[PDB]
Amino acid sequence: QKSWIESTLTKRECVYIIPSSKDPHRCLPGCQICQQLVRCFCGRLVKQHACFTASLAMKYSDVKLGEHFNQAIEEWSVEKHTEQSPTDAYGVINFQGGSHSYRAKYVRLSYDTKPEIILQLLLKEWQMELPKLVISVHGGMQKFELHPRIKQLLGKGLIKAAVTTGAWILTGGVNTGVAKHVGDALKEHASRSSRKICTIGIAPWGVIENRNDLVGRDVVAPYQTLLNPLSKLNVLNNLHSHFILVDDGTVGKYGAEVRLRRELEKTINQQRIHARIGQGVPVVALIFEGGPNVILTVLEYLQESPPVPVVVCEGTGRAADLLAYIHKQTEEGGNLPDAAEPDIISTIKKTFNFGQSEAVHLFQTMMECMKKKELITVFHIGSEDHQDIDVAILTALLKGTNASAFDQLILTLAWDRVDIAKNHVFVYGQQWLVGSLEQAMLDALVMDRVSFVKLLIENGVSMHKFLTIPRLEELYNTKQGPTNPMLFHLIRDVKQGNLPPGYKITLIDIGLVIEYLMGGTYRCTYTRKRFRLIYNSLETKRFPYPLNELLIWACLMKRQVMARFLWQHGEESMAKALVACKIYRSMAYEAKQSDLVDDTSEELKQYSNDFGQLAVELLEQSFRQDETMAMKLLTYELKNWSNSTCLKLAVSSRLRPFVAHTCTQMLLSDMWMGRLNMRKNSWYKVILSILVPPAILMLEYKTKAEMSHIPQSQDAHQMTMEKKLPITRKFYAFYHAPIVKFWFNTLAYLGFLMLYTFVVLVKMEQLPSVQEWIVIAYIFTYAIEKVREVFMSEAGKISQKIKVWFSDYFNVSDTIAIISFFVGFGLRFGAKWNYINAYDNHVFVAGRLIYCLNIIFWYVRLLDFLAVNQQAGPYVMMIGKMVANMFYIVVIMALVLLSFGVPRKAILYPHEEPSWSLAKDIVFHPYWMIFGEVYAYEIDVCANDSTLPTICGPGTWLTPFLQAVYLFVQYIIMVNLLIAFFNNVYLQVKAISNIVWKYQRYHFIMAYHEKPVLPPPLIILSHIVSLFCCVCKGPKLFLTEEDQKKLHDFEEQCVEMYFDEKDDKFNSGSEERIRVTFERVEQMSIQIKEVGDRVNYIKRSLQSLDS
Amino acid sequence: VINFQGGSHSYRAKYVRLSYDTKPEIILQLLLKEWQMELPKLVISVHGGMQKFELHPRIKQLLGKGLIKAAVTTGAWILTGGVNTGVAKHVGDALKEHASRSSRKICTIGIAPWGVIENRNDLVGRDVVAPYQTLLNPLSKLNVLNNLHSHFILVDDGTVGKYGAEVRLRRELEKTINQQRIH
């Protein structure tokens, strides 16, 4: 029937009508007054039942003929004579808008609803979250009027208890008594926190007004909140979210829900608070201004398994304050103080007039409520006692119901409340079991509870003894937390597609993910021989560096707040940040290349740039402390990250601000020098020493101690271990310096162009000249070296070597230049000569003309040599970026060109056959007009000074007007638009070009450590040796053990200085000092007004003691 | 190194395990040259009662702050009992509140015995960076070292138990510093 409520829930009607006690009121003609006023013992009168069965019985006189044997008059029970029926009510009970819209729900169910059915209602149907706290408020109806001061504290404490725990608040529902003060607390401090606060009012379907207006199946009914003057009944409170309405008889009969509300508390406390915690949901009882039936409710909570605790307030003044006074004058669980019962029972009867007879009956309840003091928490207002009742609500669930501190701690873990756990669980004197704090850590890591991981580490948990292999197997294999939906896609990409449905993840599989993300020759510690054998066997079952293992975990599970926390703890801070920058970057690249409805690539790319910024800020901190030791931090092997290097990790991430940072640029500048001391040399001297080999020995070099921060080769280190440096060592130092390899290739390249310019300008005979064979020998041997750069570069995959190398500009240009040369040399050399006149062989012409065009590639390649300079380099990279940026302005200039050329050719040349010359003529002249050529005497072809007098004809007077418009658009609009484009894009392209230039000095300078000594006409001598030693049989930074110790102390010290100066800059800013002033002046305003009230309590005794 | 299991930070420290009959010139030669320590300008030998406990919160801030600003502004050594019972628990919690990585200037030297200390056999080793736990052992009653010290001097007369051998040697250390020139 498209209604889950109708198949399960229940209305119920009083179908069998028993009249009232004896008496109809007045009005002698008795036959009419038995219908007009006589109520049913149901409670409603006889004309409102309508009783489809007994409607045929009311016509006789009524149901059930007369006197009915007085024992049988009482016989109406709601079980026997009150018949059940389907729904009649559910929908939205939207209150008339005050501050906001304020929707809510209702059900109208029976009394005999089973406890499993009512639990099934709240969770599944109404889409509510299973809570972590139930605050059942209880007090007295209709009494009223807290003070203004106490209204703020009890109001604020009830909210911050519920929004920080995600609690249900069970109220009476109706606006009398408690719920008026519960909702006014919601009026003050809402902050739209009804998403987290779910106040559930359990009222009856009785004393509520406008019950017949709520009649309806799936009806969004409006409901008014106007205080009805003539009436005395109660309305619902506007700031509730859900209503449960129970009817036993009818309007009046003010109790049916006391059992059902209490049975609801039993069902929640039997449900698990979380899918990892065996403890059940706690229930607390808050007591405002109370009553006579309240005392039976408080005692019914304490006498139960489990013993639900009770929180009692004071200051309101009723039975609430009786429980405050009775609990106060009482020590631990003995009978009484001195005999002051005439003072107690007198105080009981001033609340409600009992009169010494059953006021004694209240005292047996007051002596059982002073008995269980441990489960009673009184909140004394006026001495800031126990600090904001939300502490005292949550503390009351820890003092009584004796359980382990583990049970106290894991309860706070579900609430996500550390200030209760720090100040009331980790107190002095608390004794802990051996494995309890470890089980708390395992729960807190899965549940993404960062501030508890911080608390458990400070209170004794060691991650070294904690983080085992099977436990870290679990941390990946949880769905009981915020998981990454991307990790399972990464695992199937490295296991070739096999996916069983259960599939507990192994660490052999995670390592294959890390090696896939880090790329290159990265080898994780999971996929090596030592780990696989001890993984088969299952101390050695622990990890040496646990916080390296969890930092990867937090990144792969996309738990950034956990990752930032686990980064600060442990060693190798700048390295872990660069690894994390790479791991998120690779997952961001996999996210785009994957068919998911949730991209989450911009989230990972932001996370990659956060750790990248941390790496730069640690390098800046290390560079300010000591320049030389910071350059060592860039190049020492890490021994926990696949023997990699902080440069190699940042270059792998393409993290430009690290490579462009002034520390790496000093290191790159010093690797360029080699063992030459180019601070006290000159570039004149390096070039001179290439041409004059004996001039090498007059050059100042660097000592072994001036090179401890520079990585070297293995055999280059052997040269340094031994004015030092005898003769044959100084030749190795010179010719293997990258600066020398450069000029020794540059001078050979300039001599190459001088020859290849000579070849192409001078007449070519049949056989090549001596100059031309030197050219061929260069480009051939130059091509071999380019083949060697491809094969022997970085990445094991041969096709991946290809994709990197064709990504640079001049490497693609070299490929076209090398191929087209031998196409040209082939046509040139391998052609049948004529012997009568050259250039009657069109194959030889085509070969020569390729030389004339191929030489452009080799002059533009001088920009490639010019880009080594600090000033010229950024401009060369700038030219390319400006061409790409101005493309669409130039396209517009090309359409304006064709808009003019086509009509000019059409008007001036009306008698043309189809020819490809027409394509030339519509483009040619209008293009040269952009560049200054007006063609002054071809304008106005019918003039006397015209150089085209035969073109004069019909309508050629239009073309001067066309060309006037053309050049206005080209120079005056489009050329000046293009000047303006470059001006206003200059600074941000010059800036980008500086960083790109500085980034790519790494790949440039680290290439010259691997290039041979000898330039590309003579390099073939070096390729023979390279094949000789390979068939027959990069740089590292060496450190002794006392220099690794001094370096690790430097890395640790500079990280400590980083977080201290970061905290000192935040605490000393103007923004933070104003607000801490703001928060203290707020508290001082509270105290002085409250001390100002105490000193007014002093002057009452001044008038007394003056008397 | 007797590196404590990381709480707030790494918190390294040293130890020696020496005798009772060490000559006063030898113990002075130990602290300065070998452990690369600076000769101080103040020695604050704290003394109190073991295992008693629990200062108030208000008095914990003033006595905590005053002991640090005495030591960081003078470059002082603080001589404690070393073990976590009694005084050194309150000396180190002063270091927890107002550290500001000022262990570069603060050199708290704990002189404990090699007796009542737990995990003494785990510290057995020539040039060994040994790990050391700070877990409150429930069944036990013995004392652990305090994590926020920097140097430990450990004197054994008999064995575990026998709670006094260092009272003479700690006092003879104070004689050697007061015979050295402050500058």
Ligand SMILES: CCCCCCCC/C=C/CCCCCCCC(=O)O[C@@H](COC(=O)CCCCCCCCCCCCCCC)COP(=O)([O-])OCC[N+](C)(C)C
């Ligand atoms: C004697 C006279 C005869 C010849 C004179 C005429 C000479 C003509 C003038 C030519 C201009 C010369 C300079 C070229 C600059 C190219 C820029 C570049 O590198 O772009 C990209 C090439 O990315 C690649 O993957 C390229 C792969 C193959 C090589 C490209 C050949 C282009 C041919 C040119 C066509 C003309 C050739 C016609 C002539 C034969 C760089 O990569 P990316 O953009 O960073 O993205 C890479 C990553 N990705 C792989 C994931 C996408």
Ligand SMILES: CCCCCCCC/C=C/CCCCCCCC(=O)O[C@@H](COC(=O)CCCCCCCCCCCCCCC)COP(=O)([O-])OCC[N+](C)(C)C
């Ligand atoms: C990492 C990437 C960068 C590296 C790239 C490196 C690879 C570069 C690849 C280069 C290869 C390019 C093609 C070669 C020429 C063939 C095309 C052609 O037009 O041939 C002509 C010459 O035909 C001949 O038989 C004579 C050729 C003599 C040898 C020179 C070409 C090969 C050299 C290559 C050395 C390169 C090796 C470099 C070292 C590895 C055919 O026409 P014809 O015969 O003239 O005319 C016939 C009619 N008639 C007789 C009536 C006139």
Ligand SMILES: CCCCCCCC/C=C/CCCCCCCC(=O)O[C@@H](COC(=O)CCCCCCCCCCCCCCC)COP(=O)([O-])OCC[N+](C)(C)C
């Ligand atoms: C200074 C350069 C111009 C000079 C020529 C040499 C060019 C040198 C290289 C330039 C780099 C290219 C820049 C980006 C464009 C990529 C390719 C492309 O065409 O894309 C566009 C399609 O194209 C069109 O919509 C128009 C096609 C007409 C081109 C005709 C050339 C006329 C100019 C010739 C000169 C006549 C001179 C007469 C006047 C003096 C669309 O863009 P896209 O594909 O979506 O990509 C854009 C950016 N994105 C990747 C972020 C989306």
Ligand SMILES: CCCCCCCC/C=C/CCCCCCCC(=O)O[C@@H](COC(=O)CCCCCCCCCCCCCCC)COP(=O)([O-])OCC[N+](C)(C)C
């Ligand atoms: C924007 C709109 C433009 C129009 C679009 C339509 C284009 C249609 C193109 C058509 C060209 C083919 C038709 C002609 C056939 C060859 C014969 C010939 O004319 O030879 C002539 C030269 O010219 C040539 O040899 C041809 C020129 C080829 C380049 C054309 C560029 C086209 C595309 C752009 C590529 C640019 C590169 C960049 C690309 C990225 C030789 O003869 P002559 O010079 O008359 O001299 C006579 C005297 N003689 C006997 C002594 C020699």
Ligand SMILES: CCCCCCCC/C=C/CCCCCCCC(=O)O[C@@H](COC(=O)CCCCCCCCCCCCCCC)COP(=O)([O-])OCC[N+](C)(C)C
């Ligand atoms: C890469 C970025 C994209 C660039 C954009 C596209 C580039 C433009 C592409 C244009 C296409 C090429 C046009 C020529 C067509 C073929 C010519 C031919 O067949 O014969 C002609 C050969 O003449 C030539 O070969 C020279 C061609 C003129 C030079 C063009 C310079 C570019 C100017 C524009 C640059 C900006 C263009 C703005 C765009 C609107 C001669 O005719 P014939 O019949 O062989 O002989 C006649 C005999 N007679 C000579 C003795 C009288």
Ligand SMILES: CCCCCCCC/C=C\CCCCCCCC(=O)O[C@@H](COC(=O)CCCCCCCCCCCCCCC)COP(=O)([O-])OCC[N+](C)(C)C
């Ligand atoms: C690949 C890299 C090599 C490295 C470079 C050094 C090695 C190269 C060195 C020398 C090789 C020269 C070839 C040997 C034959 C000598 C004859 C000769 O040249 O006679 C000519 C004189 O011309 C000259 O003296 C120079 C001619 C080339 C111009 C550039 C010279 C400087 C290049 C290198 C130094 C600059 C370095 C700049 C940077 C510091 C006279 O002309 P012809 O020859 O009678 O007539 C030509 C007609 N034919 C062609 C049709 C036959």
Ligand SMILES: CCCCCCCC/C=C\CCCCCCCC(=O)O[C@@H](COC(=O)CCCCCCCCCCCCCCC)COP(=O)([O-])OCC[N+](C)(C)C
């Ligand atoms: C057939 C096609 C061969 C394949 C082409 C494809 C590329 C092949 C690879 C490379 C190109 C060839 C290598 C150079 C040798 C040239 C040979 C030659 O003919 O020399 C001639 C002169 O030559 C000279 O006097 C100098 C020649 C080379 C000088 C440069 C190399 C020195 C540097 C170190 C590097 C060493 C070289 C590097 C090697 C990689 C002698 O020949 P000839 O006939 O007696 O006389 C010439 C004309 N005559 C008869 C009118 C007088």
Ligand SMILES: CCCCCCCC/C=C\CCCCCCCC(=O)O[C@@H](COC(=O)CCCCCCCCCCCCCCC)COP(=O)([O-])OCC[N+](C)(C)C
């Ligand atoms: C991957 C690289 C691929 C390279 C492919 C290799 C291409 C090889 C292509 C062609 C081979 C040419 C050999 C001859 C073929 C038959 C014609 C013939 O014999 O002679 C005719 C030649 O006519 C011409 O036009 C010759 C030039 C053609 C090549 C054009 C440049 C291509 C390279 C672009 C630049 C490189 C860019 C590449 C950069 C990537 C006419 O001459 P003849 O007959 O001797 O007699 C005179 C006239 N008679 C007959 C009237 C008397």
Ligand SMILES: CCCCCCCC/C=C\CCCCCCCC(=O)O[C@@H](COC(=O)CCCCCCCCCCCCCCC)COP(=O)([O-])OCC[N+](C)(C)C
């Ligand atoms: C046999 C006779 C032998 C000598 C003759 C040949 C002389 C030598 C060859 C050429 C001229 C260079 C001489 C000046 C060098 C200055 C040093 C310098 O600072 O270099 C910078 C650029 O280094 C370069 O190499 C820039 C490019 C020049 C070589 C290639 C020719 C392109 C430019 C010209 C083409 C034609 C131009 C148009 C006009 C025709 C690099 O240094 P930096 O960043 O400034 O920082 C200084 C510290 N550092 C050096 C440690 C890095």
Ligand SMILES: CCCCCCCC/C=C\CCCCCCCC(=O)O[C@@H](COC(=O)CCCCCCCCCCCCCCC)COP(=O)([O-])OCC[N+](C)(C)C
């Ligand atoms: C038909 C008539 C034509 C009409 C006119 C129109 C046609 C003429 C138009 C354009 C011609 C200009 C060509 C250069 C354009 C490069 C653009 C580029 O992408 O550069 C790239 C590098 O490239 C450089 O840094 C270029 C360096 C070499 C200079 C170019 C040669 C010009 C000089 C010789 C000329 C001498 C003249 C005589 C010879 C004939 C940079 O690319 P990017 O955008 O920064 O991308 C981001 C970085 N990334 C690459 C790593 C991914």
Ligand SMILES: CCCCCCCC/C=C\CCCCCCCC(=O)O[C@@H](COC(=O)CCCCCCCCCCCCCCC)COP(=O)([O-])OCC[N+](C)(C)C
């Ligand atoms: C409109 C703006 C204000 C201007 C006001 C003043 C001007 C009034 C407006 C327009 C004037 C049009 C007529 C003038 C020609 C008189 C001379 C003549 O004969 O010329 C030629 C013909 O010329 C023609 O046959 C005219 C062609 C039609 C032009 C279409 C509109 C042009 C302007 C665009 C639209 C306008 C809007 C444009 C947007 C601003 C010569 O040919 P012929 O006769 O054979 O000569 C003998 C040749 N023979 C000896 C070689 C054999």
Ligand SMILES: C[C@@H]1CC[C@@]2(OC1)O[C@H]1C[C@H]3[C@@H]4CC=C5C[C@@H](OCCC(CO)CO)CC[C@]5(C)[C@H]4CC[C@]3(C)[C@H]1[C@@H]2C
């Ligand atoms: C959007 C833009 C509109 C303008 C435009 O670009 C695109 O549209 C293009 C189409 C081109 C024509 C296509 C076909 C031919 C036929 C050919 O027939 C051989 C004849 C003879 C050779 O001698 C046989 O022997 C001669 C050339 C011609 C007319 C082209 C001329 C240029 C034109 C007009 C181009 C022009 C730049």
Ligand SMILES: Oc1ccc2c3c1O[C@H]1c4oc5ccccc5c4C[C@@]4(O)[C@@H](C2)N(CC2CC2)CC[C@]314
């Ligand atoms: O930062 C770099 C600093 C210096 C150099 C490079 C850098 O990056 C490269 C790059 O990229 C460019 C993009 C656009 C325009 C020019 C370039 C260049 C130029 C270059 O090709 C070049 C010099 N050498 C070879 C040449 C022998 C010197 C190789 C490396 C190279």
